[PDB]
Amino acid sequence: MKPEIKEAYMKTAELFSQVSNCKRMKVGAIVVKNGSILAHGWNGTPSGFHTNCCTNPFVLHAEQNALVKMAKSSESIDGSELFCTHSPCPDCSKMIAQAGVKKVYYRNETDGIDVLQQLGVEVEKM
Amino acid sequence: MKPEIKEAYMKTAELFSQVSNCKRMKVGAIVVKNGSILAHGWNGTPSGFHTNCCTNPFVLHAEQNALVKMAKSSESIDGSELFCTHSPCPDCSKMIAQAGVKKVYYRNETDGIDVLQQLGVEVEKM
Amino acid sequence: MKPEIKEAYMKTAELFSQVSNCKRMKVGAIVVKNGSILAHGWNGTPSGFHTNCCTNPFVLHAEQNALVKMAKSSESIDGSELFCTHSPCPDCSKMIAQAGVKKVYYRNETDGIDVLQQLGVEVEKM
Amino acid sequence: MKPEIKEAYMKTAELFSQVSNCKRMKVGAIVVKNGSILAHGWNGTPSGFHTNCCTNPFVLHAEQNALVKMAKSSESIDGSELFCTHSPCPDCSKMIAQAGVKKVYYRNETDGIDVLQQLGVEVEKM
Amino acid sequence: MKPEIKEAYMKTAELFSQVSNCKRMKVGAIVVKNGSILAHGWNGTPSGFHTNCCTNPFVLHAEQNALVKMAKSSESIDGSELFCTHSPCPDCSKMIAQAGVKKVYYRNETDGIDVLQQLGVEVEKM
Amino acid sequence: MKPEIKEAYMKTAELFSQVSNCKRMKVGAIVVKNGSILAHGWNGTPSGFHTNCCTNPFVLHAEQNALVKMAKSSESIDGSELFCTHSPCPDCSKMIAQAGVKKVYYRNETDGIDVLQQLGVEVEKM
Ligand SMILES: [Cl-]
Ligand SMILES: [Cl-]
Ligand SMILES: [Cl-]
Ligand SMILES: [Cl-]
Ligand SMILES: [Cl-]
Ligand SMILES: [Cl-]
Ligand SMILES: [Zn+2]
Ligand SMILES: [Zn+2]
Ligand SMILES: [Zn+2]
Ligand SMILES: [Zn+2]
Ligand SMILES: [Zn+2]
Ligand SMILES: [Zn+2]
């Protein structure tokens, strides 16, 4: 994909990180496949949870949200790419790799990273 | 959907309007359904067209691009909402209505608009 | 595909051209992929429009109708073939090419045609 | 659906019955859902079978072909309607009912018929 | 797929054969594709049929049930594999081959079998 | 669903728990929707991981595996039911609820459980 489009994806993930409500870290994620956004996600508590403030074991990471949206989508996550504001944790990394995510782009930085690479997911900081 | 999420959608459509190459008008569109972005689009020439500069009868409107992406998606466009930077032309309006697009949000302004309403699509400027 | 099947497709597009209500031109279209019809379409006004008579800027071309049906389908339009009674206009041509339509078959005849070819869509009159 | 559209469906099933190669009976079927054809089928031997002539236990009924195409489609057969040139046999009837086919339209005539009705599928001769 | 997984599939088909109500033969089937079960099925009468006891011409074979479930699924049956407790009859065989079923595994044993092979479906007893 | 079918689901989840390689706990999960299994899963390391032995932070829970398979499926996880051999952990619970899983059935037993209930997922031990 051309350079300026790559950046538009990352900035979108950034747009969505700011929707989140966590004071510790705001994270956004975007799934892209075949020239199309398929899912977005940010970090926080599940829809219909009581407390909005996050750190709480029941808040989902941005990548978890995107992934769950893909599970309710009709479109496969396999072969897609993940644009995230942050490098993913080890728990998101396992799932991303098993999901057939081709590559992860992150803006902000580390175990998650080397495991993704071990497992054949490509990684690029931008 | 909460107010600040509505705005994040419009700003995303704006992010994508700026990817376009037309000097007359830069337009972005975003399809949203069930809390998820499903397609994006901007105005310009078809992939693999020779001249990048647009006005040329062969440039697609942002809404046409989003729509075509929905046609290659596995996910239905019916019941979704369109966030566009601009009010749509009459040609996009016909298709949006026939596609079962529930509502169109636009930032920038007019026949397209009243026809969408005639045809039962909701409209809101934001 | 065998010759007589090709013809059955064109005759079906013809069956549907005659459902239309336009006095100027009756057009039918049929999307085929992997041995299966996926969509059909004819020219006319959008469902729930007041006047049935078409020429009016709010009537959709047969190809626009088929395309919109594909957008509400779960099945991708990419790699399919279009059987139309008529050569498509430039506006339908842009969309057909961007949709990944592999080839267009038409019965009745011209800018749309050369652009489709420029853009890598195959074309055959039958 | 309007009357003349109903007829266009039946005539399409008829277009496809004539593609078949069986000397005993030529049958066509068409699946329709939400204003769109999703599958077609006719009676005959499986793709890549040696003898084209049918009666042979290895020829599929038109309804079996349509059904198998639906199984390879991404679009559900549930809630669709079947237009067939002929009333279906008991073996097709079982499957049609279990498939959630809403209604069957046939042109030409009888156990299959009453079972479809027992099982809550609607039936109409046209 | 590893050996012990193959067996887990067959045992699942066996789990489901025992749900059936036929005194003559209890059959189970399982569709597998890309490491995932997509459908299951057993032999018996259609949902909402009056008599539960089967032999009756209106009972579906396990393979017919799985196939019908695939037709109501969004996921294609093409390229999948069938695990059945029994070798399939000729009527199921025609459909399995036309469905693009890659291979059939059966536990219990014969025309269906050679036709599947004629038609390019692989077969293995286990 | 009838009682004996409920049990066949749980026994299938059990069939798959035994495929796993973890010495601490073997877990199986099964997704069911509209009378059809859509996904299965067990606990362990990601495909292509080096060490098969699990406890390791890079092993996925059975529910995580099923969920990831749903993300690569064309079929939505929303409105489905989860049969698991075990009550789910808090991390699986968040995701299950956000996924629109209607109800979870487990065989073996506790925070995950009350949160699922807080969040409107039904729960039943069997
Ligand atoms: Cl999915
Ligand atoms: Cl589509
Ligand atoms: Cl679509
Ligand atoms: Cl299917
Ligand atoms: Cl289907
Ligand atoms: Cl999915
Ligand atoms: Zn994480
Ligand atoms: Zn426009
Ligand atoms: Zn046109
Ligand atoms: Zn029949
Ligand atoms: Zn059989
Ligand atoms: Zn867990």
Side-chain angles (χ1 to χ4, degrees), chain C residues 4-5 8-9 11-12 15-16 18-19 35-40 42 69 72-75, chain D residues 4-5 8-9 11-12 15-16 18-19 35-40 42 69 72-75:
Chain C
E4 49 156 348
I5 283 185
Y9 290 141
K11 278 194 211 158
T12 298
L15 242 45
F16 285 101
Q18 301 289 291
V19 169
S36 178
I37 304 176
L38 304 177
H40 58 104
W42 59 83
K69 281 172 190 179
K72 306 182 295 197
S73 173
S74 334
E75 185 66 68
Chain D
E4 49 156 348
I5 283 185
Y9 290 141
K11 278 194 211 158
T12 298
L15 242 45
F16 285 101
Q18 301 289 291
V19 169
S36 178
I37 304 176
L38 304 177
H40 58 104
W42 59 83
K69 281 172 190 179
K72 306 182 295 197
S73 173
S74 334
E75 185 66 68

